[model samples]
Target: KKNVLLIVVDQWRADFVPHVLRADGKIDFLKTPNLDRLCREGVTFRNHVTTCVPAGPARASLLTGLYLMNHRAVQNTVPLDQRHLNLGKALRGVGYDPALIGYTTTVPDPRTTSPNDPRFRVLGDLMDGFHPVGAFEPNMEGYFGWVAQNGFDLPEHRPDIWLPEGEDAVAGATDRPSRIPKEFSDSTFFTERALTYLKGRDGKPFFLHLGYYRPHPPFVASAPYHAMYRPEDMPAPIRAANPDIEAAQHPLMKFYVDSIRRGSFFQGAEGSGATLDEAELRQMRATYCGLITEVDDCLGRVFSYLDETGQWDDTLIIFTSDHGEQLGDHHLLGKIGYNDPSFRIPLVIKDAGENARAGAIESGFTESIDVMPTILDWLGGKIPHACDGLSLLPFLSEGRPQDWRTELHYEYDFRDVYYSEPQSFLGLGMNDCSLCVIQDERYKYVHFAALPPLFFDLRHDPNEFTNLADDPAYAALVRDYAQKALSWRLKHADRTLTHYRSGPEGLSERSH
Candidate 1:
């Protein structure tokens, strides 16, 4: 009976939240009044992680409530098998008019696609189910078209407009503000589109996927936001004494540390990931915070409308991110591998029911996959049997369940079919470059397809600089965690059909 708003941001870190900072006794530099308000007004999950990395696979797991192993959208551009039931389908089945204001980055299954089909060639496109209220296409042509109609003189390249206007316009430079006006910024476009959608509710309950793009890449903000945080005031990038030391942790770590180029992150920036000076990296953090504030400010406008419309109390709002950025952690730039920074993300849910546990902070483990099931449970919809996640509604209305999971699992695929540098360099097949991570409260284990496993005693090594997988003393512990991971995988293996059977009583089906 309540409205649903699933707010998903790109590359947001859990530690960046003020409540998270307070819990960890770390200094908080972010100014997110709207997000902070949501935390105070709802249940805040302190230890939540996305099930996968990058944008495509992470969103696939997030929307479908399935692990990467099941969906098989292993990386960006890979198609999500159509057999899986996603949040959109589940919500529609329950009579909710679900709409999307952001991109899902889901590609169509290519098995049925023609050879000349353009979607298969692109990095990714929108998923099938949701109504694209203001879908930000992969090329962002729709956003640019809107900006053009709004009277801005879009440049020839169009993308370079993301660059600052002055000499500081080079990629990775954060000193100058964005060339585009704040009124037409991508953040503004999404929020404005959302307000438009809310203004005409038509009396039906709504399910909106409000996804934001900034704080993901290009690392720059417009106007006052660009100067919101000072470079010197920003937190330093966590790393070992040197890049070499961080890389020495594992062969995969070394490859990524060395392979990360400045151009990949900053369009026109120079040098590699290891070559970024302390000052530049700090400025990057500053711009990142600037972008963070931009999104927060935009969110404030949306919340204001809800309050004005008397819908604030009756709306179930879920704010989370697809994944976290490493931000130079262990000499890595993007979200990749088993590092905590790459997977740990914020999850704040404001349940609509009056009896729900509001203003509660949950310390238990939660995965991004749980978001789908959580929404379904809150809406009185049946969670699909294929979903690998359990509903978090227990925490909202009745506190944590007795059998709540104590650990988190995530997967990453490093297959590079384009230039195939990593696969060629590592002598691995396209599908062979994969890794799975299992993290409990005190320990983390990274099991690779072919590389050496990495086990960390997070209590002693929070930054995950050392690996104890090979240590004889921890051998038994590693085996135990590996078995646990195996069990988890086995348990979650696509059960959509496993529950159905043909017996003497004829066709029969039951929940897992």
Candidate 2:
């Protein structure tokens, strides 16, 4: 029996991996030796991207192997449909009881859960089928309990420990050094719990999902990692020199740039606008890199445990992030907008069997949807017809398929369904607060529901600072891509029951 170890990191950018570098060259202090080793030993999909943004919807697509349109868990608090099958359920069908050590951010279907249920209170509730081996939420009770048990004082404000030790003035600053020790940090705590579960598993094959919440917001790291990178070591943001010039590209861009405030991401930091000066931006980037390194250090312990238990050769390891962080790219702080940095994430898969390619790099486009079907394929279970993704086994073992997709397709719903501003500003309904993107080697097309479209010629404007949609030279090209986007949505519409027919054959199966 083959074992599966799936690792997901939050808000980690694709370029953070050592094998992948930014266009401005590498960050001197950013280090990920353990992940670099994974890249060296496994197959890396360089163009892997998430189909949606934030943690919830992207993860829903990852778990169900379906697009955001099919899953319809469009936003964070939105409930995922109970009728849909997930990765945990699929694995359990084949005798593997999948256990989770981190949060899935899944709000269960409200129809099945009562209003009085505790699950309704927390948006980060566990998904169906997965047993909670050591679950952690934003409140961080699990990690804090372990810290308290170890004789450490639990502060009334838990996040206070994340601030710099002596500098009380910068308590909420994102770049400040954390006072907490490495051993008691959240990343370390998650790794320790995962190790316990891994060691307890006998000879029977197991499936574990280790989710790390570092390199995400609050932008704090403990002890050594807090000082790992200097502010000067950080690379400059990839955008036009002037923030207003960049915002002038689109109305949506302007709205997002204006909406973000200081302390929005870094907690206690000062400032009121989304745009940060060069020095502040660099310091924040430095802290972000430190968080990535902290996760990498935790990964080292996991790799060592697998090696010591002789499970290294028997486990299928897949390392990836749910979605990418903007990291000040184009004056944006979070994973939103039509920028490439927000959706492009890292995907590295290492199979255990002899047929596995040792170190192959697949440059073709792949999406988060492919992850579930790939894992299910390895478990020798059937991929549900509802899944929009294709198995990546062909790329992992054999080679790239001749008929593979030439471009990547992703969708985003900006409608503040939870609120009401987007509908009012755009003069559109809740369903119209959406955008679709199709990116190929040379061009990127962004189509919106109630806004003007955007077209970028990546070959000439690699940074995507210029819009070509209004250019007379690219009019025909833009029209072609618009048609392509329409065709894609039409072709991939829900096919759950459409594959069957009621004819003379009496409920016959229609050939796919």
Candidate 3:
């Protein structure tokens, strides 16, 4: 079995990666040479998106090869069905020990745990089967302590290290570099620990899920990298003239625009996203790009390790993200709803062997759910019958299949699991506070279970500034897309036992 390396980064926009920056129309100020190398050596999926959002549900879909409807994690802190199998278990089944160097942010199934369990009190912990080479979830106390042990004097409040460099440093300002140095940064920590684990795995086949939390929140970066990109060089936020115009797009937009405080994005800062000036927003992007570069540099070290050890050709590498960040798009800061920025993410895969297509670009639609199935396919493991997504190996082994998906699908639950305000403001039941998106090259359709539907002509309104659902001219198109969505859901609905039937004589099963 070939070694598998899956790199999952958090909240990175699809356009931010170096390979797509020019094509996606973003400024080319960003530098990710290591990622660029992957682009040259691997295949870059230009039209890729996550299956769900806000971390937990997205990761559930990613790890389990199931859609949000099937996996049913729904929201952050919600329990995942314990019966669902994942990449770790599948890898172990094929005789490989899958190890995770980053946190999954997975909440334990409440049905299996007690009300007083400490794992419930925390944000999330590692899921079953994967060995925790470096667990940095629930509380980053381990990371904080690691930095301290590495000769860095951490603040009394360890998280305060994310603040700018100064004794009087404060949040909401991305102008200054992080108080901590680059050597003690999370990027370096993940790299250092991952190297140790990989080096120790002598002559053994392995699977490594190396996750990174860079370009995520706190919007701060370590020295040198923090100042890498100038705020002026960063592209402007794709927002309307004012918050009111942006909020008028949808009620959900208004809620997030009004409710999301700077404290959530930048630690210890008060005021909503509406308060942040253009300069501040651009600085946030600059810092985010710097963080991306930091991770790219760390990845370069790992790439060099594989090269020196002659494992580069024998290992399969996949780099992607859980979801994309809004980055001031639609006057929003975080990922939510049907905005393309929240779902469109990068997917680069490099498989072993001479015939493998190198530096190819696949522009066809792909979702986050395809990742698990592809890894399993690479290792000759069975793709779970319940997997909603088909393996993408065909894109590399031959070419894009003639029957490949023309539309991308994703879902979002706006229930009050993380915060109570959304449910209270929307006045909907927990199950009703959700939306599904069916998007293609020409058009994008959003169907809310309770709220009004939204439609965008992607050919014209590419940025999705205007909704055409209410327009009489597109009434038939809206209904058509809605039906397609319904059919899509019906086709993907729970197939765990559908392939098997028990007859009077015996039981028969079919595997795809």
What CA RMSD would you report for each candidate? 1.5, 2.1, 1.4
Model 3 score (lDDT):
0.87
Q: Which ten residues in a row have the lowest lDDT in candidate 3?
A: 18-27
> What is the TM-score of candidate 3?
0.97
Off by over 4 Å in 2: 22-29, 171-175, 354-356, 417-421
Q: What is the per-residue lDDT of model 3 for residues 137-234, given as tens digits with 9 covering 90 to 100? A: 67887788789899888889988888887777767857788888898998888898889899899757878999998878888888898899899999
lDDT string, candidate 1, 7-111, tens digits = 999999988888778767887888899998898889999889999998999999999998999999998877888889988888899898779998998889877
The lDDT leader among the candidates is: 3
Query: How do the predictions measure up, each by TM-score?
Result: 0.97, 0.95, 0.97
TM-score of 2: 0.95
What is the lDDT of every predicted structure here?
0.87, 0.83, 0.87
lDDT of 2 by residue, 151-220 (tens): 8997688766765667544644445467678888889888987898988886568899999988788777
Of candidates 3 and 2, the better by TM-score: 3
* Alpha-carbon lDDT of model 2: 0.83
Better structure of 1 and 2 per TM-score: 1
CA error at residue 343 for candidate 1, angstroms: 0.4
